[PDB]
Amino acid sequence: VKEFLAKAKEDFLKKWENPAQNTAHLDQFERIKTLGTGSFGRVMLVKHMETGNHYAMKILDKQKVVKLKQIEHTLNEKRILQAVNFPFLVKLEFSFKDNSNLYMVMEYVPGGEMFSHLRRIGRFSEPHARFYAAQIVLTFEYLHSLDLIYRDLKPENLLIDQQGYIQVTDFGFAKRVKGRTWTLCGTPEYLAPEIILSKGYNKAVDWWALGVLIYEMAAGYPPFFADQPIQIYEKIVSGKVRFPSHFSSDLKDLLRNLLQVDLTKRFGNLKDGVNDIKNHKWFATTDWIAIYQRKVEAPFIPKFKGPGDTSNFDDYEEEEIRVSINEKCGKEFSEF
């Protein structure tokens, strides 16, 4: 594993120091349907016309990004995604910009959102939850070794591919940092205590989010919830979590070690690091190598009708992609 990481960091660094730019154009793609939306952007199913290859394209409005003060975070997402490579991370295939927007063209994950399936199904069995959790663990092992913090783990950002495996998407809050960072980032339900306590935080927040994710997958609802954010933040600091009775003993134990407010006792952030997780009882049946190699039998396979199918996603109101005659925030996004 150390051999693999050393090699991974070399390839990563090369790309980080010399990032790729404008490797495609908008009119080479056929806009087919909006797959999802958010803050100041939307993701659509697109077809590369010359090849017939389908892709997922995120479109950001430059002015909207500036308005929401996401300039630096956006540049981070662009520079990091073009430099990383892991089977469970969505691969940025092309990126370009025009007078009005920023474009990220990535591998399309036809299976849909984990959020969708979990809400519809209610909750995942422990083995089903364990399967996804293992992919996240390995992904965080990879990302962290590169000094990257993800900061937005949640069902909404995890898509299922054709094989029923996970594809981590949306690196809008990802950042390469050594030491502590301070940005109040994330989604309320998955924020670690340190993020709300202004003392700064490190990679350990991703491990707390993992604990929230495993909890929500196995229970059907988050460990900390309430009508408004402020109510949520308070529960997160009370350091008290209630577990459903159907939770196994090993699962409750792992969770207590993951949702640990004391940063000196939280798993993933200790002396043995990620291994304290990989070797925990709840993961005894998990074959880490087989998972990385994608050879473990997926508990859920969202088969679909040929390429370009969007049946596993919801319906959104379509909107035209506007491109002014005037170049907008040219300077601000010059390196994108």
Binding site: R119, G186, P188, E189, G220, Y221
Partner: peptide, 20 residues
């Protein structure tokens, strides 16, 4: 039940991230 309280909450839909 906890499930009922969650489903009756306004936070069962896609959750928007917090920026600033």
């Amino acid at each position: 039940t906890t499930y009922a309280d969650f489903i009756a909450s306004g936070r069962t839909g896609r959750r928007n991230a917090i920026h600033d």
